[PDB]
Motif scaffolding. Structure first.
Motif, mmCIF file in Angstrom:
data_model
loop_
_atom_site.group_PDB
_atom_site.id
_atom_site.type_symbol
_atom_site.label_atom_id
_atom_site.label_comp_id
_atom_site.label_asym_id
_atom_site.label_seq_id
_atom_site.Cartn_x
_atom_site.Cartn_y
_atom_site.Cartn_z
ATOM 1 N N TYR A 161 9.788 -3.735 13.182
ATOM 2 C CA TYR A 161 8.934 -2.905 12.332
ATOM 3 C C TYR A 161 9.737 -1.954 11.448
ATOM 4 C CZ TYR A 161 5.063 0.044 10.908
ATOM 5 O OH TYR A 161 4.132 0.743 10.182
ATOM 6 N N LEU A 198 10.749 -4.133 8.645
ATOM 7 C CA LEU A 198 9.672 -4.267 7.669
ATOM 8 C C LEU A 198 9.586 -3.056 6.749
ATOM 9 C CD1 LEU A 198 6.789 -5.742 9.861
ATOM 10 C CD2 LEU A 198 8.149 -6.969 8.181
ATOM 11 N N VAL A 199 9.777 -1.851 7.287
ATOM 12 C CA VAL A 199 9.767 -0.654 6.440
ATOM 13 C C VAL A 199 10.929 -0.672 5.446
ATOM 14 C CG1 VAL A 199 9.925 1.840 6.438
ATOM 15 C CG2 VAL A 199 8.510 0.711 8.126
ATOM 16 N N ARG A 250 10.029 -3.117 2.812
ATOM 17 C CA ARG A 250 8.955 -2.654 1.940
ATOM 18 C C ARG A 250 9.448 -1.672 0.888
ATOM 19 N NH1 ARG A 250 5.512 -5.789 1.088
ATOM 20 N NH2 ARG A 250 5.396 -6.173 3.346
ATOM 21 N N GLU A 251 10.506 -0.928 1.184
ATOM 22 C CA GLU A 251 11.001 0.040 0.204
ATOM 23 C C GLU A 251 11.945 -0.547 -0.851
ATOM 24 O OE1 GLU A 251 12.153 3.215 2.988
ATOM 25 O OE2 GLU A 251 10.360 4.276 2.296
ATOM 26 N N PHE A 292 11.388 -2.109 -3.533
ATOM 27 C CA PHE A 292 10.975 -1.861 -4.913
ATOM 28 C C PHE A 292 11.633 -0.635 -5.538
ATOM 29 C CE2 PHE A 292 7.872 0.771 -2.627
ATOM 30 C CZ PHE A 292 7.929 1.933 -3.360
ATOM 31 N N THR A 293 12.115 0.311 -4.735
ATOM 32 C CA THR A 293 12.768 1.496 -5.282
ATOM 33 C C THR A 293 14.074 1.176 -5.991
ATOM 34 O OG1 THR A 293 13.902 1.924 -3.194
ATOM 35 C CG2 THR A 293 11.750 2.934 -3.521
ATOM 36 N N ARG A 294 14.679 0.029 -5.713
ATOM 37 C CA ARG A 294 15.939 -0.357 -6.326
ATOM 38 C C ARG A 294 15.685 -1.298 -7.495
ATOM 39 N NH1 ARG A 294 18.738 2.501 -2.094
ATOM 40 N NH2 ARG A 294 16.805 3.570 -1.500
ATOM 41 N N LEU A 295 16.733 -1.487 -8.279
ATOM 42 C CA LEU A 295 16.602 -2.361 -9.462
ATOM 43 C C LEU A 295 16.748 -3.829 -9.067
ATOM 44 C CD1 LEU A 295 15.948 -0.388 -11.275
ATOM 45 C CD2 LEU A 295 18.325 0.371 -11.066
ATOM 46 N N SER A 296 15.650 -4.586 -9.034
ATOM 47 C CA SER A 296 15.798 -6.021 -8.889
ATOM 48 C C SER A 296 16.612 -6.569 -10.056
ATOM 49 C CB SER A 296 14.432 -6.702 -8.823
ATOM 50 O OG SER A 296 13.800 -6.691 -10.091
ATOM 51 N N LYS A 297 17.250 -7.716 -9.826
ATOM 52 C CA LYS A 297 17.999 -8.377 -10.891
ATOM 53 C C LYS A 297 17.113 -8.709 -12.083
ATOM 54 C CE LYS A 297 17.715 -12.730 -8.266
ATOM 55 N NZ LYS A 297 18.546 -13.781 -7.613
#
Lengths: 47, 74, 34, 67
Positions: free
Chosen positions: D11, D14-15, D18-19, D21-26
């Motif tokens: 768990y 999973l957290v 889930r976070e 998205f705070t970083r820059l995806s390629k």
RNA sequence: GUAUGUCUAAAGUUAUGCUCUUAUUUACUAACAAAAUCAUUGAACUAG
RNA sequence: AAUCUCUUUGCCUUUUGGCUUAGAUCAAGUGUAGUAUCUGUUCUU
């Protein structure tokens, strides 16, 4: 699932919800505005 | 919600003028002041600096207010 | 930005300037979350 | 005990996931980059339009100065 | 859990594309619920 | 001289009804249930 650090990139959908929210709540209720956005905080919506 | 309202007009005393009153005795209406009054009828040369080299009608900017703020906010 | 251009991040990094960046377009399939 | 620990570990995982998205995806980095590279394309195009006539400016200047 | 509001119903007779089956997602609501590591102990307890 | 419909002008005709410490703070939750809801598939059309 919890979200402890909010932010990331602003999507178009978030900008459109923010604008609609501002048209309703004004510019001094950033917590009420951010409440409509899942990934952004009040201070980030104000910024 | 409409329960929170400004006053459109104040309640007139003409309404109470028609009401039939009650006989309550108020403490402030007890006898008091029952009689009226009536009128008759080298150490000083080594530094870089030295001698060797209102009222306004606006509270928020009066010197009094400024010194109040300097005194109470630190 | 202009000053820099007038004087002349990475995957997994935090963007400190995200609030000033251009909005990511909504691709035609909106995710269920959005 | 091993079970309860493994599940708290999952768990927490999973957290942490889930976070992300705070970083820059390629895909975010590429999206900004194209805007930079298509901005540099625009700059190149405009500058080419400017200097494709700026060099010929003297020839038309002489032609107009004749009369 | 309250404040508080509402109900209680014959007789004690007044004369004339668009949906469906159904497996999920998400949100809100629940004084509903004694949940197994971190000689037996949260335990009847909380309200504007 | 009298209808009907346009267009402008006028009228705004369901056209934001107080106050304070932006009145204050919060927005992490298991099972089961309740209500709404989502994708898909057949079906309706």
């Amino acid at each position: 699932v919890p979200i402890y650090v909010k932010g990331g990139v602003w999507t178009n959908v978030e900008d459109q919800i923010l604008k609609a929210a501002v048209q309703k709540y004004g510019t001094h209720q950033w917590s009420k505005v951010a409440s409509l956005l899942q990934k952004k905080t009040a201070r980030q919506s104000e910024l | 919600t409409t329960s929170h309202r400004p006053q459109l007009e104040a309640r007139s005393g003409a309404k109470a003028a028609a009401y039939t009153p009650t006989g309550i005795e108020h403490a402030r209406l007890l006898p008091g002041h029952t009689t009226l009054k009536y009128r008759k009828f080298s150490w000083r040369k080594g530094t870089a600096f030295g001698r060797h080299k209102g009222y306004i009608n606006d509270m928020t900017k009066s010197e009094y207010h400024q010194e109040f703020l300097h005194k109470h906010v630190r | 930005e202009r000053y820099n251009r007038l004087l002349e991040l990475k995957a997994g990094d935090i963007n400190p300037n995200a609030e000033t960046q251009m909005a990511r377009p909504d691709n035609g399939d909106l995710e269920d979350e959005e | 005990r091993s079970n309860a620990i493994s599940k708290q570990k999952q768990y927490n995982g999973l957290v942490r996931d889930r976070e992300s998205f705070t970083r820059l995806s390629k895909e975010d980095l590429e999206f900004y980059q194209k805007s930079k590279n298509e901005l540099l394309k625009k700059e190149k195009e405009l500058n080419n339009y400017l200097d494709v006539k700026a060099i010929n400016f003297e020839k038309k200047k002489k032609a107009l100065l004749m009369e």
